[PDB]
RNA sequence: UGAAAUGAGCGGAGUAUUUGAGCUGCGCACGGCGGCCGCACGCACUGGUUUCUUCUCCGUGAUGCUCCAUGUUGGCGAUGGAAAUGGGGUGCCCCCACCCGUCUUGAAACACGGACCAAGGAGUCAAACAGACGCGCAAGGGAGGAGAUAUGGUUGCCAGUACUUCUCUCGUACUGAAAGGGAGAUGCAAAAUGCAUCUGUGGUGUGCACACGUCAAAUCCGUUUGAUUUGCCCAACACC
RNA sequence: UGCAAGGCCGGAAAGAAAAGAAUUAGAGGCACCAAGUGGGCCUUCUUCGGUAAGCGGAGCAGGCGAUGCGGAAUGAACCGC
RNA sequence: UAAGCCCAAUUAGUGAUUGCCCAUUAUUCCUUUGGUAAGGGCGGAAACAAAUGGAGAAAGUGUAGCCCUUCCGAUGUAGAUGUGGCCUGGAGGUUAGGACGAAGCUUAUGGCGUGAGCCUAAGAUGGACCGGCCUCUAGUGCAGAUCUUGGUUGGCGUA
């Protein structure tokens, strides 16, 4: 009952049916998780400064929308 | 014969019927159909392929969402201009976290008695899609607004569980069974919570 | 009596009637002007060769004819037994039938996609009489994702939307000269589709300079392809 | 081959067939190959001279 | 209330008047002017209707659905005869007061009702001259009230 | 009456796609059973096998459905339905449902020849 | 109904969709759950992780009758109140009384932004509910 | 084989040049069959009425270089029953 | 067979027209040789000449949404046990053409099951769960058991249908082994439960429609169809 | 005032020149729910074990399986298609 | 004086550059079918009895497909899916037929459909039930299981 091992016959032609998908793009998916985490750490605190000066310049935005 | 490998593979499922049993959503369907082709408006032409949908894929709008988002509109808009009509092929559903409302006129499929009366009592209009259609005929400041589905059991539950990164829930009826080995360090590894990507 | 919105369909009807029959005649002034300035020009482009070539000679100099740059493609093997590298260059060559045709620039990168699947391909350097009668009778538009034979010059208008490609004659001269426009007038019509060589072939599985068919037969191609198309 | 489509498509085409109509006359062709060695027969000698 | 388009939508499929046979979808309402199974002409269905219909002689009798008492079934069809000798562009006219997209078909029911008359009669006239001849020994009468 | 003219009807086949090896069985009926056996000559399409039906058989929509006559045919029970083929009388030619009677089928006939309606299997003795 | 079920669509198909090679065969891979462990461990292990092991204590007799604890949050205390009670409703004035214990909860947990302000009668409270609606004009009383 | 046409040779023309001259002109396959059935003329040429028979058909092209011509008859193939035997070339229609 | 003949082909006009070939002008390219010579006659003047070579110029929407319906000359058919044309039957020619169902890498197999016919004969029912799709309602949904009375009536219809539920269940909250806790925004501040306010997407990138514009093309001049700026971005998705 | 990071505000944009200076019968992504498979066999080249084998084992790619048709008389898989 | 082998022609030193024959291939024409299909029309246009031009025109996934025009594809084991797809026994509706003949049964018996099938005709058959359409439901389709039961059968007028 000796049968065949192993073969990649067919393994390409498969993999190409529905192609070889490209990578996701670099603006995707590009968590921070793992890195160097003073770097983080500041990076994050850059980001809440960031938030709030958001916040503020759209509430500026409002008023001189109103004040027009 | 003609070299046309993967040929059907470049061909999507286009329905352009309805599974829906509904004469009225048959009714509006060929209303928003003559509309669609014979107008030059793109709103026809989006809520006619919206309500060929189906069920699961028309998900419901929440009140306090619609109150939010027109809200958000309303600022940056001159006080002259009339507030639009906010248009959900779907429902309306209403929103017991929000008790204050202003008044909107909203077109739906559906409203439910609390939201029919919310609307009304805040002031506000609850029209059906042939009042639309009679008053805004190319949708003419209209805010097309989609219902969450993110959020749906469903889809929480999509994708396998014990591979690194999956937060999907268990098909389980017993929350205690299945939560020892695969879901704990102690108990012979533990599922990673994070992969990149 | 009438109902007046067919009174208001008559009377635009009539102006669209004036209108578009100004159309065709303003279209067919200037198809005549282009065809008439393209003919010079071909005449006097051969005649200018000529003397050059008998300047060349007359005092043992050698006159280096300038390398073609356009080349016509012929498929002239089947669909089955295709590694996927010949399929894939075919595919993007557009030759996924036999004796399907196509006209492509004779650049590095066209001549190195050429080279590799040369068994299945029969190729040259078209004549301006080949490159007519490839238009003028096997020549088809891609209008709406659909193969529509070439019947007039409006549709060729329609189709380009350009101001240099209003004709059959401009469409000609384009894939002829290689113009700036080669790429969109020969990417918007469908590819040829000839009929098999009468007469017959020489031998499908060797190279023209072996004594059969899939090598670059350089000029006589025109020799195959008359007998195709 | 046809008339009415190949007019169509190139309204110069009634030009160009009396063109090639009168280059297949046969005293334009005679005489219009003995000027043309003349012609080129002198200007390759006054090239050589 | 409840609309043609939203009636038309119920009964397109089942209808006692749809008489799918073969393959064929005829229409057993007696206000459709074709017998063809579309909204234009199942004139049970439609707000306004009109329909032509044969009388006594060569007369053509007009059916008209004016929509003002189709709550009242008794008072919903009103009839109107044209004498014989009327003119089917006339009848056609008639209909078209009140359906002007049913007037082609109209004019072609008036035309086939002359003609129905007259073949009629000329039938009629023969099967008497041929029953003349015969013994027939047995004949019915209804007797009188 | 005389039926509508239309475009000569052409068949694209007119012998029967019948079931394989059912002339050597008596047990098989002649209508067609699609063969699913895995070395099935007529479903290998061998060249001298018979046929098996497709698409390209179908026949052409203009002149389809039509009989020799030139009409199509609506089966009729009673005298009350041949007025629904009055207007359309020359495209639909009435056939009397075979369970109708010989009392029945008189009072059909005598309407239909009023009517000029053609019937498919009227006596033939009338309208010649 | 059985003449929309796939049996009906396979009939003369001779094997229904379980294949030539394959065949249908009784039990081909054991019964129920059998082979968790071995042979059916990447199935148990990608899409119900954690099924093996032991956790926890043990509560031998649990009754629920004395864990029941139901909650709800600030911003859905409007559910509680009649529609006119809470139109009256104001904070300084006089305001509508809750009694969770009777619509059927224990503890109150105070998501979100209270709604109408209003006197709640709760078993048992959170400390951000209970200074939330303090803060709101309402308050909550302890019952049991 | 190909019923649909079939193949044709003359005597005296042995060559495609030959053959060409015989495009278009009629055929004719005489035979009889066991009863005499209606022909043309049947009414006004009594004497017609045989159990002689004849099927028609025109020369479409030639056959080959030596001669021979392909022959198309009208609607139905020739019998083949009819390999082998003798055939009418007419000289009609004529070009000359 | 002209039931819209779109024609270099029809129908009107006109004797012309331009376009080639000659042959030529000027400047310029081009070729010897170092500013002169050549130039087969390229390019511009759409240069000239007219010596021979071609015909050129106008014309008809659909008030027809769709389909069908219009020659000639014979033969045969003047109502019949008939003329056709199709269909059916049986023979015969010339070509094709291994026996089916299986298992198998491979069956026409010297692989296995196959004398005939009739009747029977194989993905079912229930339970749990999931996904698609239909329908109801919606921060709620729904029972079940059971009672009531039309019916406490009726052979039966009616084991149905109508009605009801401080309950029960599944949701609107989740975590922890437990003991136990228990999720809004913004502002101001930085209190080991900080205050204030509450018409509101926590932020950012990418994203329907819609709103102002802006271009390009085509227009029967009304527009419409593409792109695009900005705003708000819905659903989504990605980072916080 | 330098770096590093997260923003914001501008500017410019052959939207990619010229040098042989791409091409495309190029709608990209993204889910959900399932079935058959999971004995394979033939080549061209490359290759290992074996004296070899219609022998055993690999690589790349095609083909039979699953598929007829035209051609090598005949032949799974050769030639053409 | 190949009908063998190597080479080379295409009607042969004459005047140019396709001898001929065979595909489920190519090109083209006609028809079907299905599209990730592409478009038009769909506010009856005016008129118009018979005796003696006509009809139809449905805002539409799927039909005898609403009609017209256009383009492209069409083989396939295991397997998947669709089907105003076929067929069977009952149920709820509806609409018919029958002693002037119901089911059943018979067929050189035609017609229709690519097919599953459906319909008519005839019976020198039968003798009382039964068809269509819409929905529901299931013990719902046989060619073969050394299938079950019944009948028949060649061997065989044989051993
Ligand atoms: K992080
Ligand atoms: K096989
Ligand atoms: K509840
Ligand atoms: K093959
Ligand atoms: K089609
Ligand atoms: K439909
Ligand atoms: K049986
Ligand atoms: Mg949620
Ligand atoms: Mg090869
Ligand atoms: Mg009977
Ligand atoms: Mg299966
Ligand atoms: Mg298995
Ligand atoms: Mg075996
Ligand atoms: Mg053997
Ligand atoms: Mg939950
Ligand atoms: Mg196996
Ligand atoms: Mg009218
Ligand atoms: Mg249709
Ligand atoms: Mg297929
Ligand atoms: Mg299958
Ligand atoms: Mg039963
Ligand atoms: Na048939
Ligand atoms: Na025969
Ligand atoms: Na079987
Ligand atoms: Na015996």
């Known amino acids: 009952a000796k049968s065949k091992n192993h073969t990649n016959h067919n393994q390409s032609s498969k993999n190409h049916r529905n192609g070889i998908k490209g990578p996701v793009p670099l603006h995707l998916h590009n968590s921070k998780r793992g890195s160097w985490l003073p770097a983080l750490v500041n990076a994050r605190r850059v980001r809440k400064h960031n938030q709030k000066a958001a916040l503020k310049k759209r509430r500026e935005r409002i008023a001189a929308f109103a004040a027009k | ?197 | 009596k009438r109902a007046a919105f067919k009174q208001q369909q008559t009377e635009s009807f009539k102006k669209a009637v004036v209108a578009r029959k100004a159309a065709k005649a303003a279209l067919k002034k200037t198809a005549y002007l282009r065809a008439r300035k393209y003919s010079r020009e071909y005449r006097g482009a051969e005649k200018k060769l000529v003397t050059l070539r008998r300047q060349a000679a007359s005092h043992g100099n050698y006159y280096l004819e300038a390398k073609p740059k356009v080349a016509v493609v012929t498929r002239i093997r089947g669909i089955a037994k295709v590694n996927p590298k010949q399929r894939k260059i075919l595919q993007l060559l557009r030759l996924r039938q036999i004796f399907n045709t196509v006209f492509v620039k004779m650049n590095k990168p066209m001549e190195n996609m050429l080279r590799a699947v040369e068994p299945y391909i029969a190729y040259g350097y078209p004549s301006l009489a080949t490159v007519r009668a490839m238009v003028y009778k096997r020549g088809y538009l891609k209008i709406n994702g659909q193969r529509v034979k070439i019947t007039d010059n409006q549709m060729i208008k329609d189709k380009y939307n350009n101001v240099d490609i209003v004709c059959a004659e401009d469409m000609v001269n384009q894939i002829y000269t290689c113009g700036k426009h080669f790429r969109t007038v020969t990417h918007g019509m469908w590819p040829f589709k000839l009929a098999p060589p009468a007469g017959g072939m020489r031998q499908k599985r060797r190279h023209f300079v072996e004594g059969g068919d899939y090598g670059n037969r350089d000029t006589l191609i025109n020799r195959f392809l008359a007998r195709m198309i | 081959k046809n008339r009415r489509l190949r007019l169509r498509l190139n309204p110069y085409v009634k030009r160009e067939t009396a063109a090639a109509k009168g280059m297949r006359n046969v005293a334009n062709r005679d005489a219009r190959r003995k000027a043309k060695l003349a012609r080129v027969t002198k200007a390759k000698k006054a090239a050589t001279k | 209330s409840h609309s043609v388009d939203l009636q038309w939508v119920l009964v397109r499929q089942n209808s006692r008047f749809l008489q799918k046979r073969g393959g064929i979808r005829m229409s057993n309402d007696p206000f459709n002017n074709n017998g063809n199974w579309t909204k234009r002409h199942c004139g049970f269905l439609n707000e306004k209707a009109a329909v032509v219909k044969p009388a006594k002689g060569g007369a053509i009798c007009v059916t008209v659905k004016d929509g003002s008492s189709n709550n009242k079934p008794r008072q919903t069809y009103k009839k109107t005869v044209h004498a014989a000798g009327v003119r089917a562009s006339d009848v056609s006219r008639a209909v078209a007061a009140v359906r002007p997209d049913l007037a082609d078909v109209s004019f072609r029911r008036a035309r086939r009702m002359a003609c129905i008359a007259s073949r009629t009669a000329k039938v009629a006239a023969a099967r008497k001259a041929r029953s003349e001849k015969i013994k027939f020994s047995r004949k019915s009468a209804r007797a009188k009230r | 009456v005389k039926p509508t003219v239309s475009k000569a009807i052409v068949k694209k086949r007119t012998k029967r796609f019948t079931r394989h090896r059912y002339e050597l069985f008596p047990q098989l009926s002649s209508s067609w059973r699609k063969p699913r056996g895995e070395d099935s000559p007529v479903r290998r399409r061998y060249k001298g096998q018979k046929a098996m039906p497709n698409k390209g058989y179908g026949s052409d929509r203009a002149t389809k459905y039509i009989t020799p006559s030139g009409f199509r045919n609506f089966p009729i029970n009673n005298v009350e339905d041949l007025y629904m083929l009055v207007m359309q009388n020359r495209k639909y030619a009435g056939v009397i449902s075979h369970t109708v009677g010989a009392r029945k089928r008189k009072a059909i006939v005598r309407k239909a020849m009023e009517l000029d309606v053609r019937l498919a299997n009227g006596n033939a003795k009338l309208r010649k | 109904p059985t003449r929309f079920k796939k049996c009906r669509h396979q009939r003369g198909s001779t094997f229904c969709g379980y294949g030539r090679v394959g065949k249908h065969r009784k039990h081909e891979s054991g019964r129920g759950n059998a082979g968790g462990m071995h042979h059916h461990r990447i199935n148990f292990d990608k899409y119900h992780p954690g099924y093996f092991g032991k956790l926890g204590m043990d509560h031998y007799h649990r009754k629920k009758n004395p864990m029941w604890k139901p909650t709800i949050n600030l911003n859905n205390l409007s559910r509680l109140i009649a529609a006119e009670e809470a139109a009256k409703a104001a904070k300084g004035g006089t305001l509508p009384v809750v009694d969770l214990q009777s619509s059927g909860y224990a503890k109150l947990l105070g998501n979100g932004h209270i709604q109408v302000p209003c006197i709640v009668k709760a078993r048992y409270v959170s400390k951000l509910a209970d200074k939330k609606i303090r803060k709101a004009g309402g308050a909550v009383v302890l019952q049991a | 084989q190909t019923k649909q046409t079939a193949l044709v040779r003359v005597e005296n023309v042995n060559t495609r040049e030959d053959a060409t001259w015989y495009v278009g002109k009629r055929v004719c396959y005489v035979y009889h069959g066991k009863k005499v059935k209606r022909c043309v003329r049947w009414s006004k040429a009594p004497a017609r009425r045989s159990t002689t028979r004849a099927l028609w058909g025109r020369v479409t092209r030639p056959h080959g270089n030596a001669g021979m011509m392909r022959v198309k008859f009208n609607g139905a193939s020739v019998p083949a029953s009819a390999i082998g035997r003798r055939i009418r070339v007419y000289l009609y229609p004529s070009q000359i």
């Open chain 2, 1 to 197: 014969g003609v070299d046309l490998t993967g040929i059907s593979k470049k061909s999507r499922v286009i329905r352009h019927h309805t599974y829906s049993t509904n004469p009225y959503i048959k009714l509006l369907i060929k209303l928003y159909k003559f509309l669609a082709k014979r107008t030059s408006s793109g709103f026809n032409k989006v809520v006619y392929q919206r309500l060929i949908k189906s069920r699961s894929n028309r998900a419901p709008i929440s009140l306090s969402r619609i109150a939010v988002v027109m809200k958000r509109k309303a600022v940056f808009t001159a006080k002259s201009k009339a507030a639009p009509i906010a248009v959900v092929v779907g429902d309306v559903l209403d929103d017991v976290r929000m008790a204050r409302i202003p008044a909107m006129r909203v077109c739906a499929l559906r409203f439910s008695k609390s939201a029919r009366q919310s609307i009304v009592a805040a002031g506000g209009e609850c029209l059906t899609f042939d009042q639309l259609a009679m008053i805004a005929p190319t949708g003419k400041n209209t805010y097309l607004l989609r219902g969450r589905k993110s959020g749906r059991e469903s889809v929480r539950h999509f994708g396998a569980s014990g591979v690194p990164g999956s937060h999907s829930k268990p098909y389980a009826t017993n929350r205690g069974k299945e939560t020892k080995r695969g879901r704990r360090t102690g108990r012979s590894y533990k599922r990673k919570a994070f992969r990149h990507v």
